[PDB]
Design an enzyme around this catalytic site. Structure first.
Site, PDB file in Angstrom:
ATOM      1  CD  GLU B  52      -2.965  -1.231  -0.020  1.00 29.56           C
ATOM      2  OE1 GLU B  52      -2.939  -0.299  -0.715  1.00 29.56           O
ATOM      3  OE2 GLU B  52      -3.519  -2.221  -0.166  1.00 29.56           O
ATOM      4  CG  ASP B  53       3.103   4.813  -1.826  1.00 28.71           C
ATOM      5  OD1 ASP B  53       3.380   4.587  -3.135  1.00 28.71           O
ATOM      6  OD2 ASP B  53       3.496   5.549  -1.039  1.00 28.71           O
ATOM      7  CB  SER B  54       4.157   0.788   3.512  1.00 29.07           C
ATOM      8  OG  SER B  54       4.825   0.837   4.613  1.00 29.07           O
TER       9      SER B  54
END
Ligand code: ZN
Ligand code: ZN
Ligand code: ZN
Lengths: 65, 330, 640, 690, 43, 212
Positions: B52-54
């Site tokens: 999640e784009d982390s």
RNA sequence: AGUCGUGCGUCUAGGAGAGGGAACCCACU
């Protein structure tokens, strides 16, 4: 302010050669890559650590305090 | 910034100029006052904590001087006069004839009533000791922020326009990157660190380089952020060559030229680099896109974005929890 | 070599010169400087007369008047540390000098110590050289005034109306004085009756007259009694019978009035205030028509035909829009929008506070039947205006339109630069109208396409591009005199029926007259502007399709620099005026620090172009691409 | 005003010149190094003193290498000739000052007191692990020590237990710092004092801000200004000076800037200075007199104590301030010294009271000295002493600066007193006298020995004093003909000298040249100084004969002076005279070197030349004309010249002198027992040599 | 107990006393660091 | 401390400064030995002193640090100098009137607790230069061999032959390892100490198993 | 080629806590 003591990626000590880097750039009028190679920086992590650094410590010292 | 007593100031420990800088940056003087650092980013899903784009940030780099910040907060106090011949006084309360006393520890206060630089203050510790006479006096000290703490950096005392005593105390704190801290590249990508891994656990390239950041590839397709990969490739080429790369919008250079230069520098043309699993040393089945990239630490940090309440103060009007974490709200 | 073509890369050098000549905060500093230099004196002179008189106004260096102390020079660092107001006192001479207050001083202005300070001097003052100033230090806090977008005045805008409403097309003009005593005069002329309504009548809402009056009565009052003269003024080309057919109901209904006195009486009928129409009301109506009706064009009764001609032009535009031969005007276009910077805002605040002080001193003099100037009235007012952002005549005002002044953001240098060059739209952040929020094509080169907040403010808060500047304003009188002397026939002598071909010359929205040789006049004006005789900020636009010449000198106009291309060349191909020699001179000057952006402007190598002028020019993408391994991006062919 | 602010800033910069570059340059030197130059840099860097300097930067660049070479030569001379008492210290914490390390060490008060270490002394430190505790440490070990490091004393803080904390400044890059471990014994020995070198370097750096910087760089004296002859005659009558002296004084005072006065010995040089001072005072204006040596300052102070007459003839005694130590200055000048004048003007609760009393006494002393300096009109001192810290703190401008023996001091020393806003400078010196003291022959080769007065004289001719009184006309004949190229006129007392006797007798004449037919000189390796016995025997015989002739008729108390070029020869002569004559030689006869004897005049002068061997054609110091002029001009009535005929005849100047003596019949062959008819050998040798 | 922003000279003023520098007219009057022992770690 | 920098900033910079650790085994962890605080038997004490002057900025280097504790003849804690000039690692810059005066206590530790203790900067580890074990599937667009340059170690192994089939019995072997030392410990001693630490950990596991 | 001027300073060890609404602006998901 000052050049980082050690490379963030690997941890190689790069603060010793900052003055040597400046001298090579000025005294010998060498290009960035050649000076960095002469200093002994193979991995590009240290290359960008030295090249990308900015000497804000001198600017801060420009003030009277 | 040392002499500027701003309400909130953030100073990067080791500002670095981007490897790829647009020709307009010099006019903007961004190179002289950069906001960010060049970190070795690997576009891969290594441990699954960057989903999640982390992002996954190297703990060794974090503790070695990566994205460390200094936060300065200034508190101002005045002896504003309520009625002629009556004024506040900056003195350490002694509990005598005083009815309003707070949990803040007054021991840190000196005889003058102001904490000197180099004093540890936390929680509700009083920073400025002011008492307003009542007609014997009531405490009017400025307690330190409950959710923020640090070493007091500077204290100054002057006179206001009307001559009343005025005090300004700047407190400095060192904030190190944490999992909840938010970072972002120069292409509209915002990510919160998922896990911090030491240099041993993180994967290493064939040359022993361990990336400072790991970003999940899934951030690229949906966001259509093709410029991030090109920026990483240009930064790698500039670092290998040592000459700063031109990343202006409509530059004549193309991706093929950058790839050719990278190949001439003894690396894969498209920037893919063979990496090894740090847990066991096994070579990763799929090669990992690797290289330096510019990142910025946004002011949004979990330390100041975490709140919890358990029967705290309530509004007098409705006997309900107050609003605001700084005021111990709900 | 010296005159050889110029490559795309070398252009960057020129760009550098720009940032050296003006900088990133040039607009605000220039606006504030011009304000303090000229607008303050103009405001003082406008209300100097009283039944006492103010000769000149002087501004000293910033200082602090500490209680039980001696006044001394105050620096921005000291003001920030002590939470003092960085303002300079104002001294005005009064005759039958008095301290009237303190005007806040913007950083890097012509009235601050840091202006005439070198890098070593700035460091000695504990001031960062990288700081661009361009803000106000109020109570220590740094406040920046965001540019306010407004609809340009002295321009006719024609808009359609919804089908349910009886009105079909409304043409509105926001007339206002460009020199002093500014007041909004929104004159709207409406065409009643939708398509097929069989009632094609036009009525103009004269100011202070609630009941709309037919244009025929207004023309009769002005002095154009004959119907044929009214039609000729309204319609220039008698060949076009459609306009006459559409106007026939108008003249049919206005035929009742044939005398100027009757028209003035009818105009004065509405809005009765206990007066006698035949006794001291005809003069009142005449004065209203002289001042209230189109104040911008003139304020004298010597020549009232200019108002009639302007009204005829407005009606002609309205009829053209109704007939669909002219496209409806768009509000988003920047050519019709003005960005008021700190200059005009401070000018308005001054004007208001000075008027209040004049009223107070007049009352004091009246009380003293048989000095004592309250300076705080101005200083405190300005401090409040720059503190809470409430831009209003008084604190009690609730419609002050807060948000004009914002605390300067110093999270990072880029953030401060963006904030200093930020623009705001007065339209409320609420609503769900996407049209104003979307950036029009006119934003090219003036507003950053990408930089904009996300959310409610998206599409309203705008940030200007790097090579964007706001016109500071200049006196148009020299332009009017030059046009009159060069051969521009007076509008009074205009004879449209005997002059089928003629280009109307507009200066700041005023139809001064017409010219027979528009090409020669336009070429002469361009040559003078390039040479440097006329201020480059002035915008001149010639439209062949409408055969109209417009000249704009008012402040708040956004313009950008571009190279000038001329066919004059030995090779014969189109080439830029700037050559290798100019770039070499610029590089030599840079190395020495003689030849700067000012020299480029004077030589005509670079010209300022505004939003309106861009509609009448063709712009090439690169210096040498449009003039003469599938990896490079596809480039549009040079069809032109 | 702006001009006042600029002047104040210039004065502050001149009086607050940083010494850090000098310390950095000096500390990089190696004490053990034994070479003509401090470093191995190419010789081409050194350049001769240019007559004209384009800009101050060029002048500084030319001068600095010469100053460094002189400092290195002085360090070597101190190392070799002198052996200071070594001591030991304990290393402490080190502070990293800009390009320097400051080391704090604890030493015994008695040790430093015996050694004589002050806050402005240079030392050399070494580590000798094998040094035996009982071994007698000496400078030889330091010279041969493997590791040595130069250090500068910064502070000396006394503390209970008799413990002195010393802050030693060393070069950061020096490797010896690796041996400076905590609780480590380091053997240190003094080398020399850097105060004079520091003052010279400060003056060289500040020359840019000097008011007379342009004149110094150009070295062109201001054009003479015509003055009325009536005023000159009136001044001469009032001050009782000579016509030429009065004219020179009037011309020098009238023109503003450098003034050149060439006063040959015996021409009332002190009288000329007194006349100049009186004329300036008659026309408050503090005047600073500076002399190369303390003896000249003491003589000037003694002369001034008698008072100076004005134009009106009313003698007055302006307050005179002597800036010097009591020990170095003459006993008679002790009263005039600043310390004695201040003392005359002045006339744990107990611990706190004692400390407060001491602080109050110090403040009172400071105030008293400041008041004395402010009220003082004449300040007499040395060139090096003129830059004393007290004067710099006072910051009082001295419009008039007089320099004595301008030809006996270096340019830097002469310019040192000018730092105090010197607008008018009057330099008096005779080029024919001894050249300025120099320790390095290499520096002399680069014209370092040449003084500013020499260049000023070359640019324009000074006002030579033609009239002389003390010097006998016969004595001044040859120097006038050759050394001064004429322009010398004998005074009224050409032959009316009070010391008439011992002149009528044929053996004794005003001028004589007793050469030695045969003479052998032995050279000592340790001192490299020649010693000859024939000269000593001849001098002893002549002195004995003179005493016998006038043993009781006339007393020779302080009237006979024997001078030789070499120190060893003079010491041998003194020893022989003491052995033979006894204690009477203490007062009757004065033994001293020619250079040292300068400034002293005696009725009878015995100039003994040591150069006798003809094997080597080299002449040595005798070749220089200035030394010969100094030796000849110090006599008044009787001159006895001793030296081998051939060796002197080798030199051109000495050959001309011998020819002139032969023309005047002043040549008389002499040998052992010349006045001893009993010794037939001497008579036979004399007859054979004829 | 206090220092001047420009002069950087100690004042050691007490209560009920002017807060202006004695050497100059500036009255920033910064305060020196606390004498209490302070320790920091590289972590 | 009155430098433009911050106390925490300078402390962090000092922490990263390499120190001699040849005799680290002799030194004992502070948490182990019974001491009040930083006794000479478990810590190394250094003092940093500096200040500026008239117009020359004072640069603070590693060599400026002075050992104050008693090392008992142990060559441990000495700052590491490798630059040709010999100045060392730049620490900070002091202006006139800026006094720096501090004490530093160094304890025995491992890089796991903090990267400052890392004795090796980069440890390059490679194996199977030629794709013999099929561990990596090279990403190619035109030709895998052309796109990916041959590794330096490839010369030390026989190039693969297309004629022979894939060797499924082959296992990772012949690992090329390049160890670089920051300067605190030489690379040979670095590898020796790593082997010793791994052996000690295995022995501790065995001891725990036996005890339990 | 064999010698030399110049500088330094004098007194120092006694138990405990509790509280601001409105308006404006920036910004995050
Ligand atoms: Zn690295
Ligand atoms: Zn001060
Ligand atoms: Zn311990």
């Amino acid at each position: 302010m000052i050049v980082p003591v050690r490379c963030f990626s690997c941890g190689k000590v790069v603060g010793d050669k900052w003055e040597s880097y400046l001298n090579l750039l000025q005294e010998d009028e060498l290009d960035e890559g050649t000076a960095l190679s002469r200093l002994g920086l193979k991995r590009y992590c240290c290359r960008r650590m030295i090249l990308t650094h900015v000497d804000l410590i001198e600017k801060f010292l420009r003030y009277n305090p | 910034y040392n002499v500027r007593m701003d309400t909130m100031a953030n100073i990067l420990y080791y500002p670095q100029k981007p490897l790829g800088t647009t020709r307009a940056m010099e006019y903007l003087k961004f190179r002289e006052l950069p906001a960010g650092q060049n970190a070795i980013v690997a576009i891969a899903c290594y441990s699954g904590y960057n989903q999640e784009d982390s992002m996954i940030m190297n703990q060794s780099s974090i503790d070695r001087g990566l994205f460390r910040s200094l936060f300065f907060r200034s508190y101002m106090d005045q002896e504003k006069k309520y009625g002629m011949s009556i004024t506040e006084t900056f003195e350490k309360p002694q509990r005598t004839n005083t009815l309003r006393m707070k949990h803040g520890t007054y021991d840190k206060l000196d005889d003058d009533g102001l904490i000197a630089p180099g004093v540890r203050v936390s929680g509700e510790d009083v920073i400025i000791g002011k008492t307003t006479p009542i007609s014997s006096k009531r405490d009017a000290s400025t307690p330190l922020r409950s959710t923020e703490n640090g070493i007091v950096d500077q204290v100054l005392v002057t006179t206001n326009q009307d001559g009343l005593k005025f005090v300004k105390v700047r407190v400095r704190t060192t904030k190190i990157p944490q999992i909840g801290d938010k970072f972002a590249s120069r292409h509209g990508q915002k990510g919160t660190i998922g896990i911090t891994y030491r240099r041993e656990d993180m994967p290493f390239t064939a040359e022993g380089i361990v990336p400072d950041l790991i970003i999940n590839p899934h951030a690229i397709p949906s966001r259509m952020t093709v410029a991030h990969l090109i920026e990483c490739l240009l930064s790698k080429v500039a670092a290998l060559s040592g000459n700063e790369g031109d990343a202006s919008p409509f530059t004549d250079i193309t991706v093929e030229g950058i790839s050719k230069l990278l190949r001439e520098h003894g690396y894969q043309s498209r920037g893919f680099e063979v990496m090894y699993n740090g847990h066991t040393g096994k070579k990763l089945m799929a090669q990992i896109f690797f290289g330096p990239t510019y990142y910025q630490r946004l002011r949004h940090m979990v330390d100041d974005k975490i709140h919890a309440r358990a029967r705290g103060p309530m509004q007098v009007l409705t006997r309900q929890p107050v609003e605001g974490r700084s005021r111990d709200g709900g | 070599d010296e005159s050889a073509p110029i490559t795309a890369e070398d252009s960057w050098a020129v760009i550098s010169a720009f940032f050296r000549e003006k900088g990133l905060v040039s607009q605000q500093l220039d606006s504030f400087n011009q304000f303090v230099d000229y607008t303050l004196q103009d405001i003082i002179c406008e209300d100097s007369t009283l039944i006492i008189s103010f000769g000149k106004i002087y501004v000293t260096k910033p200082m602090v008047n500490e209680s039980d102390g001696v006044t001394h020079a105050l620096y921005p660092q000291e003001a920030r540390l002590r939470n003092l107001t960085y303002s300079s006192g104002l001294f005005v001479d009064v005759k039958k000098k008095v301290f009237i207050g303190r005007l806040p001083i913007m950083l890097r202005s012509k009235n601050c110590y840091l202006s005439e300070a070198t890098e070593s001097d700035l460091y000695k003052l504990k001031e960062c050289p990288f700081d661009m100033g361009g803000y106000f230090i109020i109570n220590g806090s740094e406040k920046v005034l965001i540019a306010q977008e407004r609809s340009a005045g002295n321009i006719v805008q024609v808009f359609k109306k919804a089908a349910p409403s009886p009105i079909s097309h409304v043409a509105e003009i926001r007339s206002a004085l460009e020199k002093g005593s500014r007041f909004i005069s929104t004159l709207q002329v409406k065409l009643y009756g939708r398509e097929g309504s069989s009632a094609r009548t036009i009525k103009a809402t004269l100011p202070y007259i609630k009941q709309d009056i037919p244009i025929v009565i207004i023309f009769r009052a002005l002095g154009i009694i004959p119907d044929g003269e009214i039609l000729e003024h309204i319609c220039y080309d008698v060949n076009d019978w459609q306009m006459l057919e559409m106007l026939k109901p108008c003249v049919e209904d206005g035929f009742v009035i044939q005398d100027r006195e009757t028209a003035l009486d009818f105009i004065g009928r509405r809005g009765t205030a206990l007066g006698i129409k035949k006794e001291k009301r005809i003069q009142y109506a005449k004065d209203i028509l002289q001042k209230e009706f189109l104040p911008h064009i003139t304020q004298l009764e010597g020549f009232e035909s200019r108002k009639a001609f302007f009204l005829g032009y407005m009606i002609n535009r309205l009829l053209l829009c109704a007939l669909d031969r002219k496209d409806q005007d768009d509000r988003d276009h920047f050519g019709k929008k003005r960005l008021d910077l700190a200059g005009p805002l401070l000018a308005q605040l001054f004007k208001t506070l000075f008027k209040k002080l004049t009223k107070d001193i007049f009352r004091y003099m009246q009380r003293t039947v048989e000095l004592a100037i309250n300076a705080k009235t101005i200083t405190s007012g300005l401090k409040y205006a720059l503190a809470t952002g409430n831009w209003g005549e008084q604190k009690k005002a609730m419609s002050s339109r807060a948000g004009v002044s914002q605390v300067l953001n110093r999270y990072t240098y880029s953030s401060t630069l963006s904030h200093l060059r930020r623009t705001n739209t007065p339209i409320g952040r609420d609503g769900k109208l996407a049209k104003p929020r979307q950036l029009h094509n006119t934003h090219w080169g003036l507003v950053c396409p990408a930089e904009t907040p996300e959310g409610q403010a998206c599409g309203l808060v705008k940030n200007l591009s790097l090579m964007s500047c706001i016109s500071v304003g200049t006196d148009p009188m020299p332009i009017i005199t030059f046009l009159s002397e060069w051969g521009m026939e007076p509008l009074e002598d205009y004879v449209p029926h005997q002059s089928p071909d003629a280009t109307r010359v507009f200066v700041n929205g005023v139809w001064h007259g017409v010219h027979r040789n528009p090409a020669r006049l336009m070429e002469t004006l361009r040559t003078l502007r390039r040479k440097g005789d006329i201020n480059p900020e002035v915008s001149m636009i010639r439209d062949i399709r409408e055969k109209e010449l417009k000249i704009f000198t008012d402040a708040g106009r956004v313009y950008r620099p571009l190279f000038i291309v001329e066919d004059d060349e030995s090779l014969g191909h189109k080439e830029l005026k700037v050559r290798k020699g100019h770039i070499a001179k610029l590089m030599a000057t840079e190395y020495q620090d003689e030849y700067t952006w000012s020299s480029l402007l004077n030589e005509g190598l670079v010209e300022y172009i505004d939003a309106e002028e861009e509609e009448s020019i063709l712009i090439a993408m690169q210096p040498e691409d449009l003039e003469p391994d599938p990896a490079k991006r596809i480039r549009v062919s040079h069809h032109a | 005003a702006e001009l006042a602010k600029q002047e104040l800033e210039h004065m502050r910069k001149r009086l607050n010149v940083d010494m850090n570059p000098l310390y950095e340059i000096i500390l990089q030197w190696d004490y053990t190094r034994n070479s003509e130059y401090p470093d191995d840099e190419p010789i081409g860097n050194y350049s001769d003193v240019k007559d004209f300097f384009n800009s101050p930067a060029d002048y500084q660049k030319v001068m600095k290498p010469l100053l460094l070479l002189e400092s290195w030569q002085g360090l070597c001379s101190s190392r070799d000739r002198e052996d200071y008492k070594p001591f030991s210290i304990i290393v402490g914490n080190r502070t990293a000052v800009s390009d320097f390390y400051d080391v704090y060490a604890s030493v015994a008060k008695q040790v430093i007191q015996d050694c004589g270490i002050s806050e402005s002394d240079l030392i050399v430190m070494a580590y000798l692990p094998d040094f035996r505790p009982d071994k007698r440490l000496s400078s030889d070990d330091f010279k041969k020590a493997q590791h040595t490091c130069l250090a500068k004393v910064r502070t000396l803080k006394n503390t209970k237990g008799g413990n002195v904390d010393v802050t030693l400044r060393i070069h950061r890059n020096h490797s010896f710092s690796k041996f400076l471990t905590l609780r480590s014994e380091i053997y240190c020995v003094k080398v020399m004092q850097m105060t004079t070198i520091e003052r010279e370097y400060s003056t060289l750096e500040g020359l840019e801000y000097y008011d007379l910087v342009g004149q110094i760089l150009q070295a062109k004296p201001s054009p003479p200004v015509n003055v009325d002859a009536a005023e000159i005659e009136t001044v001469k009558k009032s001050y009782k000076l000579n016509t030429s002296q009065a004219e020179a004084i009037v011309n020098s005072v009238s023109k503003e800037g450098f003034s050149l006065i060439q006063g040959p010995p015996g021409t009332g040089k002190t009288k000329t200075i007194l006349g100049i001072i009186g004329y300036f005072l008659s026309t408050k204006q503090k005047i600073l007199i500076c002399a190369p040596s303390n003896a000249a300052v003491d003589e000037i102070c003694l002369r001034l104590k008698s008072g100076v007459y004005d134009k009106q003839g009313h003698q007055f005694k302006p307050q005179l301030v002597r800036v010097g130590r009591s020990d170095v200055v003459n006993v008679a000048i002790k009263d005039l010294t600043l310390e004695e004048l201040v003392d005359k003007r002045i006339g744990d609760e107990m611990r706190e009271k004692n400390s407060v009393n001491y602080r109050n006494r110090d403040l009172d002393r400071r105030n008293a000295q400041a008041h004395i300096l402010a009220v003082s009109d004449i300040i007499c001192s040395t060139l090096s002493g003129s830059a004393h810290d007290v004067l710099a703190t006072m910051g009082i401008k001295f419009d008039t600066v007089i320099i004595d023996e301008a030809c006996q001091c270096t340019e830097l020393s002469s310019i040192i007193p000018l730092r105090y806003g010197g607008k008018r400078c009057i330099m008096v010196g005779d080029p024919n006298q001894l050249p300025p003291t120099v320790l390095s022959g290499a520096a002399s080769n680069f014209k370092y020995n040449q003084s500013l007065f020499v260049r000023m004289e070359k640019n324009s001719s000074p006002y030579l004093l033609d009239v002389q009184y003390r010097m006998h006309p016969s004595i001044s004949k040859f120097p006038s003909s050759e050394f001064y190229q004429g322009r010398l006129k004998d005074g009224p007392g050409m032959d009316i000298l009070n010391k008439r006797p011992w002149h009528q007798l044929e053996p004794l004449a005003p001028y004589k040249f007793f050469d030695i037919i045969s003479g052998r000189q032995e050279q000592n390796a340790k001192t490299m100084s020649y010693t000859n016995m024939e000269e000593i025997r001849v001098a002893i015989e002549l002195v004995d004969y003179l005493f016998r002739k006038f043993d009781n008729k006339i007393d020779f108390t302080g009237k006979i002076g024997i001078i030789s070029p070499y120190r060893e020869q003079m010491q041998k002569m003194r020893k022989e005279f003491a052995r033979y004559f006894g204690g009477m030689i203490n007062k009757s006869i004065d033994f001293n070197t020619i250079d040292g004897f300068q400034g002293q005049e005696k009725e009878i002068i015995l100039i003994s030349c040591v150069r006798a061997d003809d094997t080597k054609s080299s002449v040595g110091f005798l070749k220089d004309f200035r030394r010969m002029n100094v030796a000849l001009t110090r006599a008044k009535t009787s001159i006895w010249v001793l030296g081998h005929q051939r060796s002197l005849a080798k030199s051109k100047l000495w050959r001309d002198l011998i020819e002139d003596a032969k023309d005047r019949s002043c040549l008389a062959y002499a040998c052992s027992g010349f006045l001893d008819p009993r010794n037939n050998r001497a008579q036979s040798i004399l007859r054979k040599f004829n | 107990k206090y220092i001047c922003a420009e002069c950087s000279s100690k004042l050691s003023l007490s209560r009920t006393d002017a807060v202006r520098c004695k050497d100059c007219g500036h009255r920033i009057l910064l305060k020196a660091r606390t004498k209490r022992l302070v320790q920091f770690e590289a972590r | 401390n009155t430098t433009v920098l911050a106390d925490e900033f300078i402390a962090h910079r000092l922490g990263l400064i390499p120190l001699q650790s040849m005799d680290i085994e002799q030194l004992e962890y502070s948490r182990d030995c019974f001491c009040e605080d930083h006794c000479d038997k478990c810590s190394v004490v250094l003092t940093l002193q500096a200040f500026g002057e008239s117009e020359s900025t004072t640069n603070v280097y590693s060599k400026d640090l002075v050992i104050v504790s008693n090392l008992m003849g142990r060559n441990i804690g000495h700052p590491i100098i490798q630059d040709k000039e010999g100045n060392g690692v730049l620490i900070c810059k002091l202006r006139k009137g800026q006094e720096l005066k501090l004490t530093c206590v160094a304890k025995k530790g491992i890089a796991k607790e903090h990267a400052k203790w890392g004795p090796a900067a980069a440890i390059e580890f490679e194996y199977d230069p030629w794709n013999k074990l099929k561990h990596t599937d090279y990403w190619y667009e035109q030709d895998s061999a052309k796109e990916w340059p041959q590794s330096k170690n490839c010369e030390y192994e026989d190039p693969p032959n297309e004629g022979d089939p894939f060797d499924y019995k082959a296992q990772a072997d012949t690992f090329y390892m390049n160890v670089e030392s920051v300067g605190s410990i030489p690379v040979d001693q670095v590898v020796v100490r790593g082997i010793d630490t791994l052996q000690k950990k295995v022995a501790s596991i065995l001891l725990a198993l036996t005890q339990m």
